[PDB]
Ligand binder design. Structure first.
Ligand SMILES: [Mg+2]
Ligand SMILES: [Mg+2]
Ligand SMILES: [Mg+2]
Ligand SMILES: [Mg+2]
Ligand SMILES: [Mg+2]
Ligand SMILES: [Mg+2]
Ligand SMILES: [Mg+2]
Ligand SMILES: [Mg+2]
Ligand SMILES: [Mg+2]
Ligand SMILES: [Mg+2]
Ligand SMILES: [Mg+2]
Ligand SMILES: [Mg+2]
Ligand SMILES: [Mg+2]
Ligand SMILES: [Mg+2]
Ligand SMILES: [Mg+2]
Ligand SMILES: [Mg+2]
Ligand SMILES: [Mg+2]
Ligand SMILES: [Mg+2]
Ligand SMILES: [Mg+2]
Ligand SMILES: [Mg+2]
Lengths: 153, 50, 107, 65
RNA sequence: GUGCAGAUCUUGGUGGUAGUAGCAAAUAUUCAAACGAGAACUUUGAAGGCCGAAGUGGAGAAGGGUUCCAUGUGAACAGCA
RNA sequence: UCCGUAGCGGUCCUGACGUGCGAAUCGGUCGUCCGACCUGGGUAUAGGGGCGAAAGACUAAUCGAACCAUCUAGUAGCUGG
C-alpha cells in the first residue's frame, strides 16, 4: 500500500494502517500529534493515562469551545481533553504495529513512532429532524490512520 | 386490518414474496450487473400505497 | 497481614450533606465504596446485597445517618485481574452507635 | 443469558403475570434450555419456577377505623 | 450548439462556523450474579419507586401488512452504547 | 337552571417554545357540560361552483375563486446577466 512518507530505513522500520475507522477526525488528529514524538512504551502508558484521565491530549488546532484543564500545562497549552475512543483505536493500531515488528524480528523496546498521520475518510450519512418540518444532515466524520515505527537508539 | 378481502390479501401476498434479497449465485454470472436488490421495501418506511 | 477483616462505622449523614433527594441513596453507595477504597487499598470493592438493603431500607431521600460496616480484604479468585485483592463490604446490624470504636475482628 | 421467553411461558402456564414468576438465579443454565411449555411445567413441578404470593394489602387498619 | 466571474444562474462536490448549538416535558434508581473479547443500558434475583381501575392494565374497530413466533448476526439503522 | 368530572372548546399569562415535541404544541388559569350537546361510519352537494348561526370563513398545511395537465418558451416601455 502506497504510504505517504517513506521510512529512512525500511529494514528497521514497520508499518500499520487503518481505513474507515469510526472515530472523530479532530480528536484523532490531536491525539496523534500528542503520540507523534513518543517511544512505544511511553505512548502506550500515556494512552492508558488518557483513558484513565491521568494525562490529557492538548487541543491545539481544533480547540473551539474546548474547556481548560490543569493537565494541559505540561504541554505548554491551556485546552485539553481526554478522547477515550480515539485513544483506544490507535492503541489497537499500536498493538498491531507491535505485532508487525515482532514478525519482522525488530527489537521491541527500541521502537520510536517516527511517522503518524490522520486523513479524512468518506463521510457517512444520517438524518436529524428539526423545527417547522425541516430535515438536516447528521454526518459522521471517520478517519484513516497511518503510522510507521523505527528502531531509534 | 384483519377484515381483509381476497384480492387485497393476494396483493399483499405477492408484495410479501417480492421482498426477499437476491440469491448469492446470480453475480457469479458472466453478463451480470446487479449488486443487490434495489426494489426492496420496508413496512415502516414505504407504505405501499393502498 | 494481607487478608484482614475489621469493623468500622460510617457517618452517612456527613458524607451525604448537600445532595438532592433523588440521589441521596446512590450517593451513599458511592461514598461507602469510596470509603472502602480509601481504607483498604484495593480498587475492587464489592458491596453486599444486605448492605444495599440497609442503605435503601427507608427510601431514596432518608438515608440512615450512621451505619456499621465490616470490611474484609480477600484474595481474588479465578480469572486473574490487574487487581490482586478485593474488599467485601458487609452490613453489621447494631442497636446504638455509641462508644463503638474501630474494632479489629479476627478469624 | 436471556430468559425473556421462559418467564413469559411460565406466566402463561401458571396463569399469573410476569410480576409473580420467580426464576431460579443459581440454576439459570438449566432453565435456559427449556424453550417449551411441557418442559417448563416440569421445572415448575421441580421448584425452579415458583409463583410468588400476592403483595399484602391488609384490610385490618380501616376495619379498626 | 465555438471562449465565463458574476445572472438571490443550473447541477454536483467541499469549507469556516464547529467538535459549537444541542442529545433538559411527564418524581428514580441501587447491589450481586450469569452470558461475553467487551456491560450505566441485555438477562436473573433482591430492593427502592411510578402508572393507581376515566391506568403506563387486559381486548377490539379503522388503518398497517408480516411488524407476530423461533434461532443466528452485530456490517449499516435504532441522534450514547 | 347553577357548581363541577369525563367529553367538547380555547379567555388570560400577550407564560413556555419560537433553526421548537409541534409548518399552531405545552403548562397553569379558564367557557360549557340534558341540549341550538359531543362523536364514529355510511351518503349528498364540485370551482365563478359548493357550503356558510355570515368570519370572505371552509372547500386535503392551498381560498377575495382549490388542485393537475395543456394552450405556453403567454406578454413585459421593467429588474438582473
Ligand atoms: Mg484554532
Ligand atoms: Mg466561541
Ligand atoms: Mg429536533
Ligand atoms: Mg411535520
Ligand atoms: Mg408511519
Ligand atoms: Mg456541433
Ligand atoms: Mg463558474
Ligand atoms: Mg456542549
Ligand atoms: Mg393487549
Ligand atoms: Mg391497551
Ligand atoms: Mg447509535
Ligand atoms: Mg345548563
Ligand atoms: Mg354550568
Ligand atoms: Mg406568548
Ligand atoms: Mg430560545
Ligand atoms: Mg422531547
Ligand atoms: Mg350547480
Ligand atoms: Mg356554523
Ligand atoms: Mg370584511
Ligand atoms: Mg416606460
Amino acid at each position: 500500500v502506497r504510504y505517504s512518507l517513506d521510512p529512512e530505513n525500511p529494514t528497521k522500520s514497520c508499518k500499520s494502517r487503518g481505513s474507515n475507522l469510526r472515530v472523530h477526525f479532530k480528536n484523532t488528529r490531536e491525539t496523534a500529534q500528542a503520540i507523534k514524538g513518543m517511544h512505544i512504551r511511553k505512548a502506550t502508558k500515556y494512552l492508558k493515562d488518557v483513558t484513565l484521565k491521568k494525562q490529557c491530549v492538548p487541543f491545539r488546532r481544533y480547540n473551539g469551545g474546548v474547556g481548560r484543564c490543569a493537565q494541559a500545562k505540561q504541554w505548554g497549552w491551556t485546552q485539553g481533553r481526554w478522547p477515550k475512543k480515539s485513544a483506544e483505536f490507535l492503541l489497537h493500531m499500536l498493538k498491531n504495529a507491535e505485532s508487525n515488528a515482532e514478525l519482522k524480528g525488530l527489537d521491541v523496546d527500541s521502537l520510536v513512532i517516527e511517522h503518524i498521520q490522520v486523513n479524512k475518510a468518506p463521510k457517512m450519512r444520517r438524518r436529524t429532524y428539526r423545527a417547522h418540518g425541516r430535515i438536516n444532515p447528521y454526518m459522521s466524520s471517520p478517519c484513516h490512520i497511518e503510522m510507521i515505527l523505527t528502531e531509534k537508539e | 386490518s384483519s377484515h381483509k378481502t381476497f384480492r387485497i390479501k393476494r396483493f399483499l401476498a405477492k408484495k410479501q414474496k417480492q421482498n426477499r434479497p437476491i440469491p448469492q449465485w446470480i453475480w457469479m454470472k458472466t453478463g451480470n450487473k446487479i449488486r443487490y436488490n434495489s426494489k426492496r421495501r420496508h413496512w415502516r418506511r414505504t407504505k405501499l400505497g393502498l | 497481614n494481607e487478608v484482614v477483616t475489621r469493623e468500622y462505622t460510617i457517618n452517612i449523614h456527613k458524607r451525604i450533606h448537600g445532595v438532592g433527594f433523588k440521589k441521596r441513596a446512590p450517593r451513599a453507595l458511592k461514598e461507602i465504596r469510596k470509603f472502602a477504597m480509601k481504607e483498604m487499598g484495593t480498587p475492587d470493592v464489592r458491596i453486599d446485597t444486605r448492605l444495599n438493603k440497609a442503605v435503601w431500607a427507608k427510601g431514596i431521600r432518608n438515608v440512615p445517618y450512621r451505619i456499621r460496616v465490616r470490611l474484609s480484604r480477600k484474595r481474588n479468585e479465578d480469572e486473574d485481574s490487574p487487581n490482586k485483592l478485593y474488599t467485601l463490604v458487609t452490613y453489621v446490624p447494631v442497636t446504638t452507635f455509641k462508644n463503638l470504636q474501630t474494632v479489629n475482628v479476627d478469624e | 443469558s436471556m430468559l425473556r421467553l421462559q418467564k413469559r411461558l411460565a406466566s402463561s402456564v401458571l396463569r399469573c403475570g410476569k410480576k409473580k414468576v420467580w426464576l431460579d438465579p443459581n440454576e439459570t443454565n438449566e432453565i435456559a434450555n427449556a424453550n417449551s411449555r411441557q418442559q417448563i411445567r416440569k421445572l415448575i413441578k421441580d421448584g425452579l419456577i415458583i409463583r410468588k404470593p400476592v403483595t399484602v394489602h391488609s384490610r385490618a387498619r380501616c376495619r379498626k377505623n
